[PDB]
Structures are given as C-alpha cells and as structure tokens.
Amino acid sequence: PTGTNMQLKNVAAVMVTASYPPFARQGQTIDVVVSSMGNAKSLRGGTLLMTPLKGVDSQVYALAQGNILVGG
Amino acid sequence: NYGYQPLFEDRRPRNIGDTLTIVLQENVSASKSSSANASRDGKTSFGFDTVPRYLQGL
C-alpha cells in the first residue's frame, strides 16, 4: 500500500557501469562496476539484481546480475 | 531509436514536436491623469458720499 513506512537496512540503490566491447555478440558476458549512490555504508556481501544497461541512445544492450566482490 | 539523450541535463525541448509547459502569469497596469485650472477675480469701486463745495464741479 502507498501509505506505509518502509525502513530497510539490507538494500542499497546502486549505479552500474560497463563497457560494450568491439564486435560484441548476444550471450557474451562482460564485467561491471557497481557504485553506491546515497548514504550507504558498505556493499561487502551484496548481490546485484536484474539491471538493464542502457547506451547513450537509451537502449538496453546488456543485463547485469551477480555477486559483488569488494576488497575489504 | 530516439537519438542521443543527455543524462544529467535538465529535460528541455530541443526538436520539432517536443512539449513545453507555459505558466501564463500576466499582470499589466498603466494609468495617467492630468488637470489644469486658472482663475481671476477683480473688484473695484470708488464713491464720494459727501463732496465739499470746492470739489463739487469735479
């Protein structure tokens, strides 16, 4: 319901950046960088949910999902 | 494809067919006034109630 107080602690909003390689083909996998956006403390053992990676033309060129590796 | 779209720039109309919100707020008020006046009053009198004899002829 729209009127409800949700105070989460295990969820962080993140921005995902990636590089589209030359001659990229569908089904191929690429590395991504995940960066927190606001007042989050750590992303040590987090998991990235389904994220569509848009280009400059605002079209989906890849889908991102996996486990983050943070140095610590 | 809708072409290149800036990420952080404010959404502005750029091409033919783009929409824009106009907030109509007009408040115009002009006024002018003027006046002029002129007046003139003049009264004059002279009376000889009692005339001495040597002045009678005058």
Curated annotation (Swiss-Prot), chain A:
Highest taxon, organism lineage: Bacteria
Compartment(s) of residence: Periplasm; Bacterial flagellum basal body
Family in the record: Belongs to the FlgI family.
Physiological role: Assembles around the rod to form the L-ring and probably protects the motor/basal body from shearing forces during rotation.
Assembly information from the UniProt record: The basal body constitutes a major portion of the flagellar organelle and consists of four rings (L,P,S, and M) mounted on a central rod.
Protein name: Flagellar P-ring protein
Organism from which the protein derives: Salmonella typhimurium (strain LT2 / SGSC1412 / ATCC 700720)
Curated annotation (Swiss-Prot), chain B:
Locations listed in the record: Cell outer membrane; Bacterial flagellum basal body
Domain of life per record: Bacteria
Family: Belongs to the FlgH family.
Subunit structure: The basal body constitutes a major portion of the flagellar organelle and consists of four rings (L,P,S, and M) mounted on a central rod.
Role according to the record: Assembles around the rod to form the L-ring and probably protects the motor/basal body from shearing forces during rotation.
Name assigned to this protein: Flagellar L-ring protein
Organism: Salmonella typhimurium (strain LT2 / SGSC1412 / ATCC 700720)
Gene this chain is encoded by: flgH
Whole-protein residues included: 59 to 116 of 232
